DNA sequence: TTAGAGAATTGGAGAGTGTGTTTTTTTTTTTT
DNA sequence: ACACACTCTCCAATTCTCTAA
């Protein structure tokens, strides 16, 4: 009863979080000099798409606030050390 | 009560083995030929004649005449189970509703949605016609024959048989078979992903996917 | 200096209760 | 049998406080 879903640290370090992020951009392409605006649009498009995988309930700005707060926890640092360099 | 599985096998045996000394006595097994035509989508309705059944099993005829609705469902399922055996050919795509079904198959790879045939009984020759005054309450549920004059007829209307919905978020589809004269539609997605995440996706009904049948109303009066 | 555990207050997710809902006979004025 | 309006409850989210890393 009352099994309310919410985005906590264990969910954030799951596969649809940072691992999926690490792999989403290796297929993308960017145009660079004089096209930075379009590259930003493409980047944000993929980022909103990815965020919706992780927790499809919040608006994107509210989701960013949750990630900004939740980034403080040691649990995500234990995964960050793997995402940076390698496992 | 009878075991309707045994009755199903008996009905299958009738369809598989009966020949009326048919096609000028050449014994070409009328219902087998009909099943070929049905499998190749040459024909839609199939009128099973109870006089043919009486040649093998009059007790089955009596079983059908009372509580006919059970045997309607039973014969329909038997025909659906036997249909692939009389198929040999691939049929051309010719209907938008079946284009949706084809897409559904392509994506997958209830039966009511696919069951594109109709099954009806032709009354036994023993049963003389009643007048509209002699169909009293002891005949509820039983197969009857009536005689009279038509007074009024409506236009042909589309009657709903099974509804098909799509979900905005998860991209899945859902089905709802209809039997009563009224129903209540669905609203919010019951699929596990939407439910577990409580994501709140809504359901949109698709007239391109759902199944409809021709329906008409009529009145008949005493001589 | 930065972060986690134990205790107190409060929002709201959810359940329960009460109630509502064409077709016939007779008269009166004015047209005939 | 199927919809509003109202009352009420228990579960657990948010912050205070004390503590260790
Ligand atoms: Zn859904």
Closest C-alpha among A49, A68, A63 to residue A6: A63
CA angle A56, B209, B46 (to 5 degrees): 145
- Rounded to whole angstroms, the Cα distance separating B214 from B159 reads 6
A63 touches chain B (CB under 8 A): no
Name which of A2, A4, A6 is nearest A70 in CA terms: A6
Measured from the Cβ of residue B80, the count of other Cβ atoms closer than 10 Å reads 15
- Distance separating alpha carbons of residues B75 and B120, to the nearest angstrom: 9
Please tell me whether residue B47 adopts helix, strand or coil conformation.
strand
User: In angstroms, rounded to a whole number, what is the distance separating the alpha carbons of residues B133 and B146?
Assistant: 10
- For residue B35, the number of C-alpha atoms closer than 13 Å in the C-beta half-sphere is 24
> H/E element holding A4?
none
Q: Residue B199: its chain A contacts at CB < 8 A? A: 56-57
For residue B47, give the nearest of B64, B30, B60 by alpha carbon. Answer: B30
Q: Do B199 and A57 touch (CB under 8 A)?
A: yes
Strand partners, B202: B188
Cβ B54 vs Cβ B127: under 8 Å: no
> What is the rounded CA–CA span in Å between residue B120 and residue B130?
20
d(CA B196, CA B191): 9
Indicate the burial class of B129 (C-beta count within 10 angstroms; 0-12, 13-18, 19 or more). Answer: exposed
A53 — phi, psi (to 5°)?
A: -65, -45
With H, G, I as helix, E, B as strand and everything else as coil, classify residue B166. Answer: strand
The pairing of beta strand B211-215 with beta strand B118-122: unpaired
Residue with tokens 């007790």: B59
How close is the nearest chain B Cα to the Cα of A79, in Å? 24
Rounded CA separation A54/B128 (Å): 71
- Expt. technique: cryo-EM
Encoding tokens for residue B60? 């089955």
Cα B214 to Cα B153, B155, B161, distances in angstroms:
14, 10, 10
Q: Cα–Cα distance between B4 and B9 in angstroms, integer?
A: 9
Residue ranges of the alpha helices (H) in B109-152?
111-114
Please report which helix (H) or strand (E) contains residue B160, including its range: strand B157-167
Q: What three-state secondary structure class fits B153?
A: strand
**DSSP class of B132:** T
Q: For chain C, which bases have at least one atom within 7 A of a protein Cβ? A: 3-4, 13-14
Determine which helix (DSSP H) or strand (DSSP E) holds B151, and give its type and residue range: strand B149-153
- Chain A residue with the nearest C-alpha to that of B194: A56
Rounded Cα distance between B4 and A12, Å, is 55
Picking from B19, B118, B14, the residue whose alpha carbon sits closest to that of residue B60 is B14
CA A80, A83, A84, A86 dihedral sign is: positive
Identify the CA nearest to B69 among candidates B147, B179, B176, B159: B179
Q: Which of B106, B90, B72, B83 is nearest to B35 (CA)?
A: B83
Protein chain A, residues 65-84, with a C-beta closer than 7 Å to any atom of nucleic acid strand D: none
- DSSP secondary structure string for all residues of A12-68: HTSTTTHHHHHHHGGG-----TT-HHHHHHHHHHHHHHHHHHH-TTS-HHHHHHHHH
Mutate which of A56, A57, A58, A63 to test chain B, going by most B C-beta atoms within 10 A? A56
Cβ atoms of A50 and A24 within 8 Å: the answer is yes
Buried b (16+ CB within 10 A) or exposed e, B169-207: bbebbeebeeeeeeeeeeeebebeebeeeebebebeeee
B215 DSSP 8-state letter = E
Q: Assign B161 to helix, strand or coil.
A: strand
Write the CA distances from B37 to B34, B84, B112, integer angstroms: 5, 12, 20
The rounded distance, in Å, linking the Cα atoms of A41 and A38 is 5
SS3 for B68? Answer: helix
Resolution for this PDB entry, in angstroms = 3.4
**Which residues sit opposite B120 in a β-bridge?**
B47
**Euclidean distance between CA atoms B7 and B60, whole angstroms:** 9
A4 sits within 7 Å of strand D by its CB = yes
């Amino acid at each position: 009863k009352r099994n309310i879903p919410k985005l906590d640290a264990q969910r954030l370090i799951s596969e649809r979080g940072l691992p999926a992020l690490r792999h989403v951009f290796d297929k993308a392409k960017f145009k660079g000099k004089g096209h930075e605006a379009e590259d930003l649009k493409m980047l944000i498009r993929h980022m909103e798409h990815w965020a919706h995988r992780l927790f499809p309930k919040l608006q994107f700005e509210d989701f960013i606030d949750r990630v900004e707060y939740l980034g403080s926890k040691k649990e995500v640092q234990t995964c960050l050390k793997r995402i940076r360099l390698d496992l | 009560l009878k075991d309707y599985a045994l009755e199903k096998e008996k009905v299958k045996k009738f369809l598989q083995e009966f020949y009326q000394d048919d096609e000028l006595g050449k014994k070409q097994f009328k219902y087998g030929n009909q099943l070929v035509r049905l499998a190749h989508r040459e024909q839609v309705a199939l009128y099973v004649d109870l006089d043919d059944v009486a040649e093998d099993d009059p007790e089955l005829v009596d079983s059908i005449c009372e509580n006919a609705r059970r045997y309607a469902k039973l014969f329909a399922d038997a025909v659906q189970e036997l249909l692939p055996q009389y198929k040999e050919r691939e049929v051309v795509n010719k209907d938008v509703l079946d284009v949706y079904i084809e897409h559904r198959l392509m994506m997958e790879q209830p039966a009511e949605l696919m069951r594109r045939f109709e099954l009806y009984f032709q009354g036994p020759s023993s049963n003389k016609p009643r007048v509209i005054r002699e169909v009293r309450a002891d005949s509820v549920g039983k197969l009857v024959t009536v005689r009279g004059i038509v007074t009024r007829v409506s236009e042909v209307k589309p009657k709903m048989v099974v509804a098909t919905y799509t979900c905005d978020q998860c991209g899945a589809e859902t089905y709802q078979p209809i039997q009563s004269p009224t129903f209540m539609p669905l609203i919010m997605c019951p699929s596990q992903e939407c439910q577990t995440n409580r994501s709140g996706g809504r359901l949109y009904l698709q007239t391109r996917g759902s199944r409809f049948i021709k329906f008409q109303e009529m009145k008949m009066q005493e001589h």
